[PDB]
mmCIF file of all heavy atoms in Angstrom:
data_model
loop_
_atom_site.group_PDB
_atom_site.id
_atom_site.type_symbol
_atom_site.label_atom_id
_atom_site.label_comp_id
_atom_site.label_asym_id
_atom_site.label_seq_id
_atom_site.Cartn_x
_atom_site.Cartn_y
_atom_site.Cartn_z
ATOM 1 N N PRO Z 1 153.622 126.724 125.815
ATOM 2 C CA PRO Z 1 154.631 127.107 124.825
ATOM 3 C C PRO Z 1 154.286 128.429 124.160
ATOM 4 O O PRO Z 1 153.117 128.793 124.010
ATOM 5 C CB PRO Z 1 154.595 125.952 123.822
ATOM 6 C CG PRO Z 1 153.207 125.429 123.920
ATOM 7 C CD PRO Z 1 152.801 125.591 125.361
ATOM 8 N N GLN Z 2 155.329 129.150 123.757
ATOM 9 C CA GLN Z 2 155.173 130.410 123.046
ATOM 10 C C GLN Z 2 156.226 130.491 121.953
ATOM 11 O O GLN Z 2 157.420 130.345 122.227
ATOM 12 C CB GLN Z 2 155.294 131.607 123.995
ATOM 13 C CG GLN Z 2 154.044 131.874 124.811
ATOM 14 C CD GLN Z 2 152.839 132.175 123.946
ATOM 15 O OE1 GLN Z 2 152.895 132.059 122.722
ATOM 16 N NE2 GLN Z 2 151.741 132.567 124.577
ATOM 17 N N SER Z 3 155.780 130.717 120.722
ATOM 18 C CA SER Z 3 156.695 130.756 119.592
ATOM 19 C C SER Z 3 157.480 132.061 119.570
ATOM 20 O O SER Z 3 156.978 133.125 119.940
ATOM 21 C CB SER Z 3 155.926 130.589 118.283
ATOM 22 O OG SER Z 3 154.647 131.191 118.369
ATOM 23 N N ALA Z 4 158.728 131.968 119.126
ATOM 24 C CA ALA Z 4 159.587 133.127 118.943
ATOM 25 C C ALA Z 4 160.368 132.936 117.655
ATOM 26 O O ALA Z 4 160.540 131.804 117.191
ATOM 27 C CB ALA Z 4 160.542 133.319 120.128
ATOM 28 N N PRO Z 5 160.851 134.019 117.050
ATOM 29 C CA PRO Z 5 161.589 133.887 115.786
ATOM 30 C C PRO Z 5 162.838 133.039 115.972
ATOM 31 O O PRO Z 5 163.749 133.397 116.720
ATOM 32 C CB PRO Z 5 161.929 135.337 115.426
ATOM 33 C CG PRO Z 5 161.926 136.053 116.731
ATOM 34 C CD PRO Z 5 160.844 135.405 117.543
ATOM 35 N N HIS Z 6 162.873 131.903 115.276
ATOM 36 C CA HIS Z 6 163.984 130.959 115.376
ATOM 37 C C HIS Z 6 164.206 130.525 116.824
ATOM 38 O O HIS Z 6 165.327 130.526 117.335
ATOM 39 C CB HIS Z 6 165.263 131.552 114.783
ATOM 40 C CG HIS Z 6 165.143 131.930 113.341
ATOM 41 N ND1 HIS Z 6 165.177 131.002 112.323
ATOM 42 C CD2 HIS Z 6 164.995 133.136 112.745
ATOM 43 C CE1 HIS Z 6 165.050 131.619 111.162
ATOM 44 N NE2 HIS Z 6 164.939 132.915 111.390
ATOM 45 N N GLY Z 7 163.120 130.151 117.487
ATOM 46 C CA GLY Z 7 163.211 129.690 118.857
ATOM 47 C C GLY Z 7 161.836 129.491 119.451
ATOM 48 O O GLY Z 7 160.809 129.736 118.810
ATOM 49 N N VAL Z 8 161.838 129.035 120.700
ATOM 50 C CA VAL Z 8 160.617 128.802 121.459
ATOM 51 C C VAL Z 8 160.800 129.372 122.856
ATOM 52 O O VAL Z 8 161.881 129.261 123.445
ATOM 53 C CB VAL Z 8 160.262 127.302 121.526
ATOM 54 C CG1 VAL Z 8 161.338 126.539 122.273
ATOM 55 C CG2 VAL Z 8 158.909 127.110 122.186
ATOM 56 N N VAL Z 9 159.747 129.990 123.382
ATOM 57 C CA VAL Z 9 159.761 130.599 124.706
ATOM 58 C C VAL Z 9 158.676 129.936 125.541
ATOM 59 O O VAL Z 9 157.503 129.932 125.151
ATOM 60 C CB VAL Z 9 159.545 132.118 124.638
ATOM 61 C CG1 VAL Z 9 159.313 132.680 126.028
ATOM 62 C CG2 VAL Z 9 160.735 132.789 123.976
ATOM 63 N N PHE Z 10 159.065 129.383 126.683
ATOM 64 C CA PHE Z 10 158.136 128.724 127.586
ATOM 65 C C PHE Z 10 157.687 129.683 128.684
ATOM 66 O O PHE Z 10 158.282 130.737 128.913
ATOM 67 C CB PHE Z 10 158.772 127.472 128.195
ATOM 68 C CG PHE Z 10 159.007 126.370 127.205
ATOM 69 C CD1 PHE Z 10 160.240 126.218 126.601
ATOM 70 C CD2 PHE Z 10 157.994 125.489 126.879
ATOM 71 C CE1 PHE Z 10 160.459 125.208 125.691
ATOM 72 C CE2 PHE Z 10 158.207 124.477 125.970
ATOM 73 C CZ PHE Z 10 159.441 124.337 125.376
ATOM 74 N N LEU Z 11 156.613 129.298 129.368
ATOM 75 C CA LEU Z 11 156.014 130.083 130.440
ATOM 76 C C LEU Z 11 155.711 129.197 131.640
ATOM 77 O O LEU Z 11 154.605 129.200 132.182
ATOM 78 C CB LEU Z 11 154.750 130.790 129.960
ATOM 79 C CG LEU Z 11 154.939 131.845 128.871
ATOM 80 C CD1 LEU Z 11 153.653 132.622 128.652
ATOM 81 C CD2 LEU Z 11 156.079 132.778 129.227
ATOM 82 N N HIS Z 12 156.699 128.405 132.057
ATOM 83 C CA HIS Z 12 156.528 127.470 133.163
ATOM 84 C C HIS Z 12 155.785 128.116 134.326
ATOM 85 O O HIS Z 12 156.173 129.179 134.815
ATOM 86 C CB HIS Z 12 157.893 126.965 133.640
ATOM 87 C CG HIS Z 12 158.832 126.610 132.530
ATOM 88 N ND1 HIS Z 12 158.597 125.569 131.659
ATOM 89 C CD2 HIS Z 12 160.018 127.149 132.160
ATOM 90 C CE1 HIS Z 12 159.591 125.487 130.795
ATOM 91 N NE2 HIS Z 12 160.468 126.434 131.077
ATOM 92 N N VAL Z 13 154.713 127.463 134.764
ATOM 93 C CA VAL Z 13 153.917 127.911 135.899
ATOM 94 C C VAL Z 13 154.304 127.030 137.080
ATOM 95 O O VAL Z 13 154.045 125.822 137.081
ATOM 96 C CB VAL Z 13 152.413 127.839 135.615
ATOM 97 C CG1 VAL Z 13 151.627 128.382 136.796
ATOM 98 C CG2 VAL Z 13 152.076 128.603 134.346
ATOM 99 N N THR Z 14 154.921 127.630 138.090
ATOM 100 C CA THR Z 14 155.424 126.892 139.233
ATOM 101 C C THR Z 14 154.554 127.159 140.460
ATOM 102 O O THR Z 14 153.557 127.881 140.407
ATOM 103 C CB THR Z 14 156.885 127.257 139.499
ATOM 104 O OG1 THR Z 14 157.035 128.680 139.481
ATOM 105 C CG2 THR Z 14 157.780 126.649 138.432
ATOM 106 N N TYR Z 15 154.946 126.559 141.584
ATOM 107 C CA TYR Z 15 154.197 126.678 142.836
ATOM 108 C C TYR Z 15 155.223 126.640 143.972
ATOM 109 O O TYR Z 15 155.638 125.567 144.412
ATOM 110 C CB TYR Z 15 153.160 125.571 142.960
ATOM 111 C CG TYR Z 15 152.569 125.387 144.341
ATOM 112 C CD1 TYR Z 15 151.428 126.074 144.724
ATOM 113 C CD2 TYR Z 15 153.138 124.508 145.251
ATOM 114 C CE1 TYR Z 15 150.880 125.902 145.979
ATOM 115 C CE2 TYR Z 15 152.597 124.330 146.506
ATOM 116 C CZ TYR Z 15 151.470 125.030 146.864
ATOM 117 O OH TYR Z 15 150.928 124.855 148.115
ATOM 118 N N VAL Z 16 155.628 127.816 144.424
ATOM 119 C CA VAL Z 16 156.667 127.961 145.441
ATOM 120 C C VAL Z 16 155.998 128.241 146.782
ATOM 121 O O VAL Z 16 155.177 129.164 146.867
ATOM 122 C CB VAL Z 16 157.661 129.079 145.079
ATOM 123 C CG1 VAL Z 16 158.203 128.868 143.676
ATOM 124 C CG2 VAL Z 16 157.002 130.439 145.192
ATOM 125 N N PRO Z 17 156.297 127.475 147.828
ATOM 126 C CA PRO Z 17 155.665 127.726 149.128
ATOM 127 C C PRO Z 17 156.022 129.104 149.667
ATOM 128 O O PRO Z 17 157.142 129.589 149.498
ATOM 129 C CB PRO Z 17 156.224 126.608 150.016
ATOM 130 C CG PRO Z 17 157.484 126.184 149.345
ATOM 131 C CD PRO Z 17 157.235 126.342 147.879
ATOM 132 N N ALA Z 18 155.048 129.730 150.318
ATOM 133 C CA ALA Z 18 155.217 131.043 150.923
ATOM 134 C C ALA Z 18 155.631 130.876 152.387
ATOM 135 O O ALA Z 18 156.071 129.801 152.801
ATOM 136 C CB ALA Z 18 153.937 131.868 150.757
ATOM 137 N N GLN Z 19 155.500 131.943 153.176
ATOM 138 C CA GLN Z 19 155.945 131.990 154.564
ATOM 139 C C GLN Z 19 155.612 130.718 155.332
ATOM 140 O O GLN Z 19 154.573 130.093 155.096
ATOM 141 C CB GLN Z 19 155.319 133.193 155.270
ATOM 142 C CG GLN Z 19 155.041 134.365 154.348
ATOM 143 C CD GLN Z 19 153.681 134.271 153.692
ATOM 144 O OE1 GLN Z 19 152.755 133.674 154.241
ATOM 145 N NE2 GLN Z 19 153.550 134.862 152.511
ATOM 146 N N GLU Z 20 156.492 130.332 156.252
ATOM 147 C CA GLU Z 20 156.359 129.098 157.009
ATOM 148 C C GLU Z 20 156.576 129.375 158.490
ATOM 149 O O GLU Z 20 157.207 130.363 158.874
ATOM 150 C CB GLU Z 20 157.354 128.035 156.526
ATOM 151 C CG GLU Z 20 158.803 128.333 156.884
ATOM 152 C CD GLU Z 20 159.363 129.517 156.123
ATOM 153 O OE1 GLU Z 20 158.587 130.185 155.407
ATOM 154 O OE2 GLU Z 20 160.576 129.783 156.239
ATOM 155 N N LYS Z 21 156.042 128.484 159.321
ATOM 156 C CA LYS Z 21 156.146 128.583 160.767
ATOM 157 C C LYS Z 21 156.950 127.417 161.326
ATOM 158 O O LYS Z 21 157.053 126.351 160.714
ATOM 159 C CB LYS Z 21 154.758 128.614 161.417
ATOM 160 C CG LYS Z 21 153.942 129.853 161.094
ATOM 161 C CD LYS Z 21 152.613 129.843 161.832
ATOM 162 C CE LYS Z 21 152.808 129.570 163.314
ATOM 163 N NZ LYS Z 21 153.763 130.526 163.936
ATOM 164 N N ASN Z 22 157.523 127.633 162.507
ATOM 165 C CA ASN Z 22 158.287 126.607 163.200
ATOM 166 C C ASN Z 22 157.361 125.764 164.067
ATOM 167 O O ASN Z 22 156.477 126.291 164.748
ATOM 168 C CB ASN Z 22 159.380 127.236 164.064
ATOM 169 C CG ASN Z 22 160.302 128.140 163.270
ATOM 170 O OD1 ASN Z 22 160.583 127.883 162.100
ATOM 171 N ND2 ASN Z 22 160.775 129.206 163.903
ATOM 172 N N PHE Z 23 157.571 124.450 164.040
ATOM 173 C CA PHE Z 23 156.746 123.514 164.787
ATOM 174 C C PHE Z 23 157.625 122.495 165.497
ATOM 175 O O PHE Z 23 158.741 122.202 165.063
ATOM 176 C CB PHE Z 23 155.750 122.793 163.872
ATOM 177 C CG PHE Z 23 154.716 123.697 163.273
ATOM 178 C CD1 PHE Z 23 154.992 124.424 162.129
ATOM 179 C CD2 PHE Z 23 153.467 123.822 163.853
ATOM 180 C CE1 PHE Z 23 154.043 125.258 161.576
ATOM 181 C CE2 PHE Z 23 152.514 124.653 163.304
ATOM 182 C CZ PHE Z 23 152.801 125.372 162.164
ATOM 183 N N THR Z 24 157.105 121.958 166.602
ATOM 184 C CA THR Z 24 157.806 120.935 167.377
ATOM 185 C C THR Z 24 157.319 119.565 166.914
ATOM 186 O O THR Z 24 156.423 118.952 167.495
ATOM 187 C CB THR Z 24 157.581 121.142 168.870
ATOM 188 O OG1 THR Z 24 158.226 122.351 169.290
ATOM 189 C CG2 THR Z 24 158.148 119.973 169.663
ATOM 190 N N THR Z 25 157.929 119.084 165.834
ATOM 191 C CA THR Z 25 157.535 117.814 165.245
ATOM 192 C C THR Z 25 157.969 116.654 166.138
ATOM 193 O O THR Z 25 158.594 116.833 167.187
ATOM 194 C CB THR Z 25 158.131 117.672 163.847
ATOM 195 O OG1 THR Z 25 157.297 116.815 163.058
ATOM 196 C CG2 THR Z 25 159.526 117.076 163.925
ATOM 197 N N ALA Z 26 157.630 115.440 165.709
ATOM 198 C CA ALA Z 26 157.996 114.229 166.431
ATOM 199 C C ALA Z 26 157.954 113.060 165.463
ATOM 200 O O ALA Z 26 157.099 113.029 164.573
ATOM 201 C CB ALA Z 26 157.052 113.977 167.614
ATOM 202 N N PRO Z 27 158.861 112.091 165.604
ATOM 203 C CA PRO Z 27 158.897 110.988 164.628
ATOM 204 C C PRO Z 27 157.617 110.170 164.574
ATOM 205 O O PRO Z 27 157.223 109.732 163.486
ATOM 206 C CB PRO Z 27 160.092 110.134 165.081
ATOM 207 C CG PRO Z 27 160.623 110.744 166.322
ATOM 208 C CD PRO Z 27 159.843 111.953 166.690
ATOM 209 N N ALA Z 28 156.952 109.950 165.703
ATOM 210 C CA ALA Z 28 155.800 109.056 165.730
ATOM 211 C C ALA Z 28 154.912 109.419 166.915
ATOM 212 O O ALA Z 28 155.083 110.466 167.549
ATOM 213 C CB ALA Z 28 156.251 107.594 165.782
ATOM 214 N N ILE Z 29 153.954 108.541 167.214
ATOM 215 C CA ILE Z 29 153.002 108.735 168.301
ATOM 216 C C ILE Z 29 152.497 107.368 168.734
ATOM 217 O O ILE Z 29 152.409 106.439 167.929
ATOM 218 C CB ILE Z 29 151.830 109.652 167.877
ATOM 219 C CG1 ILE Z 29 152.224 111.122 168.000
ATOM 220 C CG2 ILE Z 29 150.587 109.359 168.699
ATOM 221 C CD1 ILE Z 29 151.173 112.073 167.481
ATOM 222 N N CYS Z 30 152.173 107.241 170.020
ATOM 223 C CA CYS Z 30 151.661 105.983 170.542
ATOM 224 C C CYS Z 30 150.786 106.250 171.756
ATOM 225 O O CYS Z 30 151.144 107.050 172.625
ATOM 226 C CB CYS Z 30 152.800 105.025 170.908
ATOM 227 S SG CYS Z 30 153.531 105.297 172.539
ATOM 228 N N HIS Z 31 149.637 105.580 171.805
ATOM 229 C CA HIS Z 31 148.717 105.667 172.929
ATOM 230 C C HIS Z 31 148.475 104.278 173.503
ATOM 231 O O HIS Z 31 148.269 103.314 172.758
ATOM 232 C CB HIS Z 31 147.392 106.328 172.513
ATOM 233 C CG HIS Z 31 146.537 105.484 171.622
ATOM 234 N ND1 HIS Z 31 145.716 104.485 172.101
ATOM 235 C CD2 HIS Z 31 146.367 105.498 170.279
ATOM 236 C CE1 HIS Z 31 145.081 103.918 171.090
ATOM 237 N NE2 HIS Z 31 145.458 104.514 169.974
ATOM 238 N N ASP Z 32 148.510 104.188 174.830
ATOM 239 C CA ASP Z 32 148.402 102.930 175.570
ATOM 240 C C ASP Z 32 149.237 101.830 174.913
ATOM 241 O O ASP Z 32 148.736 100.786 174.491
ATOM 242 C CB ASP Z 32 146.943 102.499 175.736
ATOM 243 C CG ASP Z 32 146.244 102.256 174.416
ATOM 244 O OD1 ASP Z 32 145.787 103.240 173.799
ATOM 245 O OD2 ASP Z 32 146.147 101.084 173.996
ATOM 246 N N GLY Z 33 150.539 102.090 174.836
ATOM 247 C CA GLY Z 33 151.491 101.095 174.380
ATOM 248 C C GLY Z 33 151.248 100.579 172.977
ATOM 249 O O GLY Z 33 151.280 99.368 172.742
ATOM 250 N N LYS Z 34 151.006 101.488 172.033
ATOM 251 C CA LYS Z 34 150.782 101.101 170.641
ATOM 252 C C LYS Z 34 151.367 102.203 169.761
ATOM 253 O O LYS Z 34 150.743 103.254 169.583
ATOM 254 C CB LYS Z 34 149.301 100.883 170.361
ATOM 255 C CG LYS Z 34 149.018 100.092 169.097
ATOM 256 C CD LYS Z 34 149.128 98.597 169.344
ATOM 257 C CE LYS Z 34 148.022 98.108 170.264
ATOM 258 N NZ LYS Z 34 146.671 98.379 169.702
ATOM 259 N N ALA Z 35 152.558 101.957 169.222
ATOM 260 C CA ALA Z 35 153.223 102.960 168.402
ATOM 261 C C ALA Z 35 152.410 103.256 167.148
ATOM 262 O O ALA Z 35 151.866 102.350 166.511
ATOM 263 C CB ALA Z 35 154.627 102.487 168.020
ATOM 264 N N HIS Z 36 152.331 104.535 166.795
ATOM 265 C CA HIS Z 36 151.610 104.984 165.613
ATOM 266 C C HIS Z 36 152.534 105.833 164.757
ATOM 267 O O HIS Z 36 153.440 106.498 165.267
ATOM 268 C CB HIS Z 36 150.359 105.789 165.985
ATOM 269 C CG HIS Z 36 149.226 104.950 166.488
ATOM 270 N ND1 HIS Z 36 148.451 104.170 165.657
ATOM 271 C CD2 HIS Z 36 148.736 104.770 167.737
ATOM 272 C CE1 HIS Z 36 147.534 103.546 166.373
ATOM 273 N NE2 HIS Z 36 147.685 103.892 167.637
ATOM 274 N N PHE Z 37 152.297 105.812 163.454
ATOM 275 C CA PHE Z 37 153.103 106.543 162.492
ATOM 276 C C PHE Z 37 152.202 107.352 161.578
ATOM 277 O O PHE Z 37 151.040 106.994 161.357
ATOM 278 C CB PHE Z 37 153.971 105.589 161.657
ATOM 279 C CG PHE Z 37 155.375 105.445 162.167
ATOM 280 C CD1 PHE Z 37 155.690 104.469 163.096
ATOM 281 C CD2 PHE Z 37 156.378 106.285 161.720
ATOM 282 C CE1 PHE Z 37 156.981 104.333 163.569
ATOM 283 C CE2 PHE Z 37 157.669 106.154 162.189
ATOM 284 C CZ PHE Z 37 157.971 105.177 163.115
ATOM 285 N N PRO Z 38 152.707 108.452 161.029
ATOM 286 C CA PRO Z 38 151.899 109.256 160.109
ATOM 287 C C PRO Z 38 151.678 108.535 158.792
ATOM 288 O O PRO Z 38 152.488 107.713 158.356
ATOM 289 C CB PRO Z 38 152.735 110.530 159.914
ATOM 290 C CG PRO Z 38 154.005 110.333 160.727
ATOM 291 C CD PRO Z 38 154.113 108.878 161.029
ATOM 292 N N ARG Z 39 150.573 108.864 158.118
ATOM 293 C CA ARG Z 39 150.231 108.124 156.872
ATOM 294 C C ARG Z 39 150.417 109.014 155.637
ATOM 295 O O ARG Z 39 150.883 108.484 154.610
ATOM 296 C CB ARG Z 39 148.813 107.560 156.999
ATOM 297 C CG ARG Z 39 148.592 106.814 158.307
ATOM 298 C CD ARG Z 39 147.163 106.360 158.507
ATOM 299 N NE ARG Z 39 147.062 104.917 158.661
ATOM 300 C CZ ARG Z 39 145.923 104.265 158.849
ATOM 301 N NH1 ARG Z 39 144.783 104.932 158.904
ATOM 302 N NH2 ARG Z 39 145.925 102.951 158.978
ATOM 303 N N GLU Z 40 150.067 110.302 155.716
ATOM 304 C CA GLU Z 40 150.326 111.179 154.580
ATOM 305 C C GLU Z 40 151.334 112.269 154.903
ATOM 306 O O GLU Z 40 152.333 112.414 154.187
ATOM 307 C CB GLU Z 40 149.018 111.816 154.084
ATOM 308 C CG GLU Z 40 149.205 112.722 152.876
ATOM 309 C CD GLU Z 40 148.133 113.787 152.765
ATOM 310 O OE1 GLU Z 40 147.349 113.948 153.724
ATOM 311 O OE2 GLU Z 40 148.077 114.468 151.719
ATOM 312 N N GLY Z 41 151.106 113.040 155.967
ATOM 313 C CA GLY Z 41 151.949 114.150 156.322
ATOM 314 C C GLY Z 41 152.830 113.865 157.519
ATOM 315 O O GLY Z 41 153.050 112.711 157.911
ATOM 316 N N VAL Z 42 153.346 114.938 158.112
ATOM 317 C CA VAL Z 42 154.252 114.863 159.250
ATOM 318 C C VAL Z 42 153.587 115.522 160.448
ATOM 319 O O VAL Z 42 152.951 116.573 160.316
ATOM 320 C CB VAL Z 42 155.606 115.530 158.940
ATOM 321 C CG1 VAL Z 42 156.189 114.966 157.657
ATOM 322 C CG2 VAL Z 42 155.439 117.035 158.841
ATOM 323 N N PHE Z 43 153.731 114.899 161.614
ATOM 324 C CA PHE Z 43 153.145 115.444 162.826
ATOM 325 C C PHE Z 43 153.678 116.849 163.092
ATOM 326 O O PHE Z 43 154.777 117.219 162.674
ATOM 327 C CB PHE Z 43 153.445 114.540 164.020
ATOM 328 C CG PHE Z 43 152.775 113.201 163.950
ATOM 329 C CD1 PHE Z 43 153.331 112.103 164.579
ATOM 330 C CD2 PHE Z 43 151.593 113.036 163.253
ATOM 331 C CE1 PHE Z 43 152.721 110.869 164.518
ATOM 332 C CE2 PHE Z 43 150.978 111.802 163.189
ATOM 333 C CZ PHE Z 43 151.543 110.720 163.822
ATOM 334 N N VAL Z 44 152.875 117.639 163.799
ATOM 335 C CA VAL Z 44 153.224 118.998 164.185
ATOM 336 C C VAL Z 44 152.687 119.251 165.589
ATOM 337 O O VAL Z 44 152.027 118.397 166.187
ATOM 338 C CB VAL Z 44 152.679 120.045 163.193
ATOM 339 C CG1 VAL Z 44 153.422 119.955 161.871
ATOM 340 C CG2 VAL Z 44 151.188 119.847 162.986
#
């Protein structure tokens, strides 16, 4: 927060993603007949 005459001025600190790349994702994965799914992120 930052005080101003008859008001308040904020200084929100954000986090905007920068440049990104294209990837050939896939919904899931399975080895020797056992479907697997991602636990935190997304496959790439």
Side-chain angles (χ1 to χ4, degrees):
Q2 282 300 7
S3 34
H6 301 283
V8 64
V9 170
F10 292 96
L11 296 189
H12 317 295
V13 183
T14 48
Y15 166 90
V16 307
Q19 330 88 28
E20 71 291 7
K21 294 183 50 55
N22 304 326
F23 294 84
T24 293
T25 207
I29 277 175
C30 83
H31 71 81
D32 61 278
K34 197 83 67 59
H36 285 285
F37 263 90
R39 311 175 121 180
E40 181 206 10
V42 307
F43 293 153
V44 290

